[PDB]
Structure 1
Amino acid sequence: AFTIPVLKISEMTNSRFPVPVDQMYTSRSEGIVVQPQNGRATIDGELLGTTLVSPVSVCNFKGNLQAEVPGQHQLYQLQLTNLDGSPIDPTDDTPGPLGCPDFTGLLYGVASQRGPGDATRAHEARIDTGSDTFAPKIGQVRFYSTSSDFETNQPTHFTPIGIYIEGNSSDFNQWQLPRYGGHLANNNHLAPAVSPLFPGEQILFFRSFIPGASGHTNGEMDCLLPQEFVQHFYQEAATARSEVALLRFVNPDTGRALFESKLHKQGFMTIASSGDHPIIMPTNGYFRFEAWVNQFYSLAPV
C-alpha cells in the first residue's frame, strides 16, 4: 500500500540544501523553468537527476587537493571523488555527481582535511558553481579560501553552509542549472522541468531560507519534495496506482483538514492557488495520503 511519513513542516528537511524546511510556498514561476536536479524522485521510488538519499550530503564535495591554481592565490583545485569515495565516472546516467549543487552562485562553506596521519585543518571556502571551470561531471572543481593552510594531496571535504552575494552576475540564481560538464559542455540525464497543467493550480514548494555569508539575500531555496519523502519513496517503492496521489493537510489539534494537494507520480505537488505567497498553517499540521485520483481531480483553493 502507498503511504507518506507523518511530518510537521518544521520536521522536514530541504532536499536541495541540508537545512530544515522553513515554510510551504507557492508561485506562478512566471518566465522560470523549474528544473531542480536534487530532491527528484518518483512516488514509486525511482531517483532522478543528481538526487541521493542521504539528507546530509546535498551540496557537499569530496576529493583530492590537487594543487593551488597557477597565477591565482588561494584558489585550489580539487579532483573530486563521488561522495561515497568512488571515482568520478562521467559516463554515469546522471547530469553530474550525486548531491552536486543544482543552482548557480557562490556557494559558501568550509573546506576541511585530515592528513597526513590524524592532522586536521579547516577554513572558509567558496565555490562558484557558475564559473567556466566548474565541471563536477568530470571531477574538476575549484574553491577559493582566505587561508593558505591547506595540504596538497590530502583528502579534502567541502561542507556547504550558505551563499555569498558579491552583487554581480555570479549572484545566486536557484533556478539556473550549472553546466555540470564545464563551459564547453551541454547537460544530460536531466530530471525534467515541471509545471502545473491543470487550470487554477500552482506547484507547492518546500522553502528554506539558507544562510547568507555576505551581501543581501533572503536565501530562498525551493524544493519539490522534502528529503524525507524522497527517502520514503525510495525505501517503499510502492506501486503508483494512478498518476496522482491525493494528499490532505490535516490539523491534529482540531482534528479537521485545511487543504488538499495533488502529489504527481513524477515527484511534485500542486495546489489550487493563485499568486506568489507563503502557505502558513497551524504548526502541527501534516499531509496524509487519502486516495488515488487523476490529473484532472479538482481541488478547492487555498
Structure 2
Amino acid sequence: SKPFTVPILTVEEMTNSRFPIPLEKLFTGPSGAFVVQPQNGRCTTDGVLLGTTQLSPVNICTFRGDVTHIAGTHNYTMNLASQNWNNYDPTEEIPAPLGTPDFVGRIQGMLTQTTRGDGSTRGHKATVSTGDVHFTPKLGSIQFNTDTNNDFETGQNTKFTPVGVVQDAHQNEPQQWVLPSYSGRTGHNVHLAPAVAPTFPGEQLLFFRSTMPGCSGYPNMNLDCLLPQEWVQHFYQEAAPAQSDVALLRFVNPDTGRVLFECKLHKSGYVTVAHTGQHDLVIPPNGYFRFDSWVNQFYTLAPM
C-alpha cells in the first residue's frame, strides 16, 4: 500500500492556496469566533480535490470570459468561461468555477484582453467586489469596476489577474473567513467543502499564512490557508491511501535533525497543533514537514 508523504519544501518555498502569493509563516490561533470554511486549498490526503480547489498556484482568484460594458459607468459584466476558455457549466456540482475567490472583499488586479483578428491587446486596473449583488460566479457572471468606460471590446477573450485587496474602521475588510454568496441573493451556496475545527482538547488549527498585497486604504491583509498549494498538487498525484483519519507530521530542522513540534494532518485535509492562543510559530527557514505515522483520533500531541 503506497506510503503517504508530504513535500519536503520549506514554508517559504511554498504557495498560498487561497491567493497567488508565497507562504510567509505558520500561525495558530483560536477559531471559535468564526466559521473556518475556505473553498480553495481544500484537498484530502488521498488526493481528492474539494470545494472550488484546482491545481494551479497561479489561477487562484483569476477569472476568464467575455465582457460587456455597463452604460454610463466604468463597470463591466464578465460572462465567465472555464479556465481553458470553453463554456462554463453551472450544473457541475461545485460551489463556483474552480479558483473563484473564497472570501468577501474587494480584490484589485488587472483585466487584460486580446482581439482575435489582429492580436491587439489592452489592460486596465480593475476591482471585483465579492460581497456585492453582482458577484454571481456560480450563475456565470460577475461585475468589475475599472479605470475605463470604453476600451474593452465585446466578444473577445478577457482575463482578470488578481494583485491585492482594498479597503475603505481599519482592517474591517476583507473578511477572509466569510464566504461570498456564489449565486448572490438568488440562492444559497452548494457543494461546499465542510467547515473545519479542532476537536481535541487543547488543540487549534495550524494555518499557513501569507500577507496579501494591499492596493488602497487600510485592508486586513492576513490570509490563512489550510494546506499549501504544493501539498494539494502532491496529494493529487500520489493519491496515497489514508490508513487512519489522522497523519502525524513532525516539523524538522534538517541541519540539527531536531524536531521542533508535531502536528496532526487530518485526512480530510487540514492541520491541528496542541496550543492555545494566537502564536506566530518560530521556525528555522530550512525547516520542513515530515510524515511519520498514521495515528488514531485520540492521539495526544506533544505541546507546541
Question: Which band: TM-score by shorter chain?
Answer: over 0.9
Contact 1:212 1:219 in 2 (8 A): yes
Distance in 2 between the 1:170 and 1:185 partners?
26
Aligned to 1:54: 56
Contact 2:198 2:272 in 1 (8 A): yes
| Residues 244, 44 of structure 1: alpha-carbon distance in 2 compared, 3 angstrom cutoff | same
Aligned to 1:138: 139
Distance in 2 between the 1:248 and 1:103 partners?
30
Distance in 2 between the 1:185 and 1:88 partners?
18
| Equivalent residues in 2 for 1:8-47, closer than 5 Å | 8-47=10-49
1:23-45 CA-partner distances (Å, limit 9, x unpaired): 00011013100000000000011
3-state SS, counterpart of residue 183 of structure 1: helix
Distance in 1 between the 2:292 and 2:86 partners?
41
Moved more, 100-109 or 214-223: 214-223
Moved more, 178-187 or 259-268: 178-187
3-state SS, counterpart of residue 38 of structure 1: coil
Contact 2:171 2:218 in 1 (8 A): no
Distance in 2 between the 1:290 and 1:263 partners?
11
Give 5+ residue unaligned stretches, structure 2. none
Distance in 2 between the 1:136 and 1:225 partners?
24
Aligned to 1:186: 188
3-state SS, counterpart of residue 153 of structure 2: coil
Post-superposition offset of 1:171: 2.7
Contact 1:133 1:182 in 2 (8 A): yes
What CA RMSD, in Å, does the superposition of the two structures yield over aligned residues?
Answer: 1.4
Counterpart of 1:64 (choices 32, 46, 66) is: 66
TM-score (norm 2): 0.96
Counterpart of 1:244 (choices 246, 254, 267) is: 246
Aligned to 1:109: 109
Aligned to 1:291: 293
TM-score (norm 1): 0.97
Aligned-residue sequence identity (percent) comes to 54
Post-superposition offset of 1:78: 0.6
Distance in 1 between the 2:141 and 2:161 partners?
17
1:47-66 CA-partner distances (Å, limit 9, x unpaired): 0000001111110000011x
Contact 1:133 1:183 in 2 (8 A): no
Distance in 2 between the 1:217 and 1:75 partners?
22
